[PDB]
Amino acid sequence: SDHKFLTQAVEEAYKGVDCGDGGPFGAVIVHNNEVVASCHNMVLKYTDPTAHAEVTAIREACKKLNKIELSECEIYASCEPCPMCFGAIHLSRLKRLVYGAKAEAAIAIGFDDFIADALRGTGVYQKSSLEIKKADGNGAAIAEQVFQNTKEKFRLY
Amino acid sequence: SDHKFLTQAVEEAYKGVDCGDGGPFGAVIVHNNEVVASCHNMVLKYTDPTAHAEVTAIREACKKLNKIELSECEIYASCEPCPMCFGAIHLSRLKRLVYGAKAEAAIAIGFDDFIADALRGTGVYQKSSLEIKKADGNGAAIAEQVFQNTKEKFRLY
Ligand SMILES: O=c1[nH]c(=O)c2ncn([C@@H]3O[C@H](CO)[C@@H](O)[C@H]3O)c2[nH]1
Ligand SMILES: O=c1[nH]c(=O)c2ncn([C@@H]3O[C@H](CO)[C@@H](O)[C@H]3O)c2[nH]1
Ligand SMILES: [Zn+2]
Ligand SMILES: [Zn+2]
């Protein structure tokens, strides 16, 4: 099931960059194999620098489920969540995170050198016991290729 | 001017608690002593765990100026911004953060031990360049008092 939802996040990244909503980032929030939210980066469409794919997905899932905690849900991110998005995942009480590409793949096409210490376990104050899986193999290769594939179809931000 | 805007952020915190919008947190974004945004936590109002005072203020400031970067603006937070909000502050390119109370003040009254390494200077992957001022004296007293005064006047989240 991990491959299915990570693939959906990747295709959301492509869709969002193709419609000009924002950058090539997708996020899918699922509740026991039922997709609650399927979103991409909306920074350009919303004129909102916080409207990352993950934050957008959290907003939508919480509004749809009428609760501010997503402890029964998991989030699939096309790319490794940034510090803001990882903090949002923590505040959401999401119980699992699966992400496709490492943040370096986005940094390679010019994005901010902006990586969540708590995700990589390199913090003094911020810790995390969130279950975190970095995908490998097939879906991971596809997810990493997103940034080379889309790098001239959108504005950096 | 720092004290005036920090006190307005604290006033926003009290205001938001009174109307049941969310927790005792406020944020004011200014552009050369002109207020661009004045908000409080809206997590309960919006059913959105990302709607912290800082994130709400960034969204509204960027909507008012019709741009996704706030490089000429400064932000005043009644309480030390969390990892999510400090990440959003990074992404917004706000050039200066002035915050009132230490995160320990919010932790003492029930909020998560959820502290941003990059704000306190212990981040490894996240490196902030923005100027950061922790308020002293009367401003610190105001901001810390927020959490004693609003104890059990709001629903925790
Ligand atoms: O988690 C993220 N979600 C996004 O939508 C997004 N859009 C851009 N970025 C930037 O990509 C880099 C790798 O996380 C960081 O510079 C992010 O700010 C994003 N990070
Ligand atoms: O930066 C923040 N803005 C808020 O609105 C807010 N509301 C609650 N909290 C929590 O307070 C603690 C200290 O920052 C952390 O547990 C935050 O999640 C907040 N942090
Ligand atoms: Zn992000
Ligand atoms: Zn916050």
Numbering used by the authors:
A (entry chain D), B (entry chain A): 29 to 185
Which text from the study accompanies this structure?
In plants, guanosine deaminase (GSDA) catalyzes the deamination of guanosine for nitrogen recycling and re-utilization. The other involves the hydrolysis of Gua to guanine (G), followed by its deamination to xanthine under the action of guanine deaminase (GDA). Both deaminases are zinc-dependent enzymes, which rely on a catalytic water molecule to attack the amino group-connecting C2 atom to proceed with the catalysis. The zinc ions are tightly bound to the active site, coordinated by the completely conserved residues His80, Cys113, Cys110, and the key water molecule. AtGSDA catalysis needs two key sub-processes: the activation of water and re-capping of the active site, which proceed via the two critical residues Glu82 and Tyr185, respectively.
As a reference, we first cocrystallized the natural substrate Gua with the WT enzyme. The quick soaking process (within 2 min) resulted in the complete deamination. Specifically, the essential C-terminal loops of the enzyme would re-cap the active site by forming the key contact with N7 of Gua via the side chain of Tyr185. However, it was not difficult to tell that Xan stabilizes the enzyme more than Gua.
